[PDB]
């Protein structure tokens with residue numbers, strides 16, 4: 001299963017990714033994760049990226065496409081993969097089509113997790129993620145068993161620097177602007193599918209699973 005998740009910041013892409021990866025054992029490729037790792041490690045790309053992320057802006061396309069091209073070629077992606085929050089622009093999506101054509105791993109479905117903007121500030125400011133394994137929690141909607149401790153590795157949870165009210169408002173604007181063109185791109189391709197992301201996380205996952213059920217695992 002060769003999959004893309006798309007959706008606004010806070011829509012639940014990571015939360016569903018965790019469940020898809022657990023159930024199907026495919027690699028999770030998250031450009032935000034990659035950029036945050038590089039930033040933590042202090043690499044030149046991480047430091048460049050940090051500037052955009054801190055503002056809530058997108059990292060430029062070509063560097064982003066580069067890291068994805070490199071990632072997607074690995075042997076662990078032979079039996080499927082899950083792209084989470086890439087592509088984010090039409091240019092990214094056009095480059096991805098070429099990339100997948102070259103290695104013979106074309107997309108099965110793009111899954112649009114649809115959430116209205118007026119619930120996303122509360123989703124993002126109460127988001128808490130594990131420092132070690134990146135497991136996602138929410139202080140209201142999905143708290144850990146023990147406060148501040150990841151249920152999966154027992155790591156400490158933290159608040160992403162970009163999940164602050166001002167940067168959230170920028171991220172929503174910047175990504176909303178990219179959405180209609182990117183949705184139209186894939187709608188024209190024919191394999192865009194929508195999932196209502198304003199349901200309990202389990203019900204959202206049920207809808208995702210039922211869509212994936214036509215694919216080989």
Ligand SMILES: Nc1ncnc2c1ncn2[C@@H]1O[C@H](COP(=O)(O)OP(=O)(O)OP(=O)(O)OP(=O)(O)OP(=O)(O)OC[C@H]2O[C@@H](n3cnc4c(N)ncnc43)[C@H](O)[C@@H]2O)[C@@H](O)[C@H]1O
Pocket residue numbers: 007008009010011012013014015016030031032033035052053054056057058059060061064084085086087088092123124126127128136137138139141142171197198199200201204
């Ligand atoms: N391709 C690209 N090109 C250019 N730049 C790029 C790029 N990719 C990354 N970047 C750069 O990197 C930055 C960060 O990218 P990124 O890390 O991808 O952050 P984002 O794009 O801001 O998306 P999030 O990861 O913010 O949201 P999500 O949809 O995963 O939601 P979650 O499941 O966590 O859920 C949110 C919260 O709500 C909760 N929740 C989840 N589902 C539900 C539900 N059904 N009900 C209630 N609460 C829920 C969760 O527990 C959690 O607390 C970008 O801003 C940009 O600078």
Ligand SMILES: [Mg+2]
Pocket residue numbers: 013014030032084085
């Ligand atoms: Mg994410």
Ligand SMILES: [Zn+2]
Pocket residue numbers: 130131132133134135150151152153154155
């Ligand atoms: Zn953890």
